[PDB]
Amino acid sequence: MPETANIKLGYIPIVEAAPLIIAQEKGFFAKYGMTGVEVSKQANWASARDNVTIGSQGGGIDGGQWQMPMPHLITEGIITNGNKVPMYVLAQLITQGNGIAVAPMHEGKGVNLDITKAADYIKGFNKTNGRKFKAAHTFPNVNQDFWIRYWFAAGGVDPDTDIDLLAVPPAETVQGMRNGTMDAFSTGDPWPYRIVTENIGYMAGLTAQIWPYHPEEYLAIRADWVDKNPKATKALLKGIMEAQQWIDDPKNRPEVVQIVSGRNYFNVPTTILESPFKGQYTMGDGQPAIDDFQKGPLYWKDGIGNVSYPYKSHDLWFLTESIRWGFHKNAIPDLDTAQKIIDKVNREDLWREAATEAGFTADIPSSTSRGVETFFDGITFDPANPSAYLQSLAIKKV
Description:
The complex is composed of two ATP-binding proteins (CmpC and CmpD), a transmembrane protein (CmpB) and a solute-binding protein (CmpA). By secondary structure, the chain is of the alpha/beta class. It folds into two domains: about 1-95 and about 210-375, D-Maltodextrin-Binding Protein, domain 2 (3-Layer(aba) Sandwich), CATH 3.40.190; about 95-210 and about 375-398, D-Maltodextrin-Binding Protein, domain 2. The protein contains 18 helices and 14 strands. The protein has helices at about 20-25, 30, 45-55, 70-75, 120-125, 125-130, 145-155, 170-180, 190-195, 205-210, 225-230, 230-245, 255-260, 270-275, 310-325, 335-345, 350-360, 385-390, and strands at about 5-10, 35-40, 65, 85-90, 100, 135, 165, 185-190, 200-205, 220, 280, 290, 375, 380. Helix 1 (about 20-25) packs across helix 12 (about 230-245) and helix 12 crosses helix 17. The longest helix is centred in the middle third of the chain and has 18 residues, at about 230-245.
């Protein structure tokens, strides 16, 4: 019996939110006693951040969906103006379902997955086209900022000095692309489908290509709530695990799409989500379309290991990449400090415990590390030596 059947979890209306919505709507949360879960739509990431800092009692949220390393940054008060609100990372919600969109003006320039040959074109855009190449994500220092930064830098473009990388709302960004004032957009489903079908732009590449089966969105809840309600926390985890398993069975995806697209959730036409849930993406710019289930969003198991289990080696990559770009210079000055933060935030042990109790022992990874990670450009990240990873990178601020 959970200590409480209630909790307010925030979500952003994108495919990464699926496990939360499905766990609620298909009764997986209820199956384990969590009959009072409120899946609350957040206006944007800044609002989500603010709402978890105030907690449910103050009218906000107890936890929810997050881009990494938001839970860690909030725990240390780094992005909350010093207001430290400890949080626990409990499960990875999904992998893939993200990608980089580029404006039509850049077609035929080689601005695809590997932009190496187009680097000079991008770097000299102000002289040749009247403005610095402009790219956007919707929140700094997290997932989507990292994806586009890695993509730019892998090809020789410094995302801080060579272009204008800004935090801009998604709708405003797409309008900018339509108006010809925005050049690239680090986004995710359902945006790519609309951008391409409405001829607003093309997809340079999917994160599924940049880093196959990469860590992405996570479930994280305030530490004070989890410490007070350990049983309820494990119940929520089991509900999420079952929802993830359910979502990954192709037979259930039409219903998954119908549910999340509903008026009370995403409130969008199912047509813009049907394709990606089959791993089908029209890429454009003369490149072949993608038609591979393994390249679409995955919620339970991927080609390497278990999606849901939160590998500490992935938390390490996010903080290592934060260090790469000189983010939070005073708060996270070294890798030792990063590991200390990870050891207080990542609660993979609770995922293991919940999985064991639920009878999913066969799906539990044998280590807290998924081993050496390989990016599309040949660079490898060995969790045992993040220093070597950083030193192997051409563009960085350390």
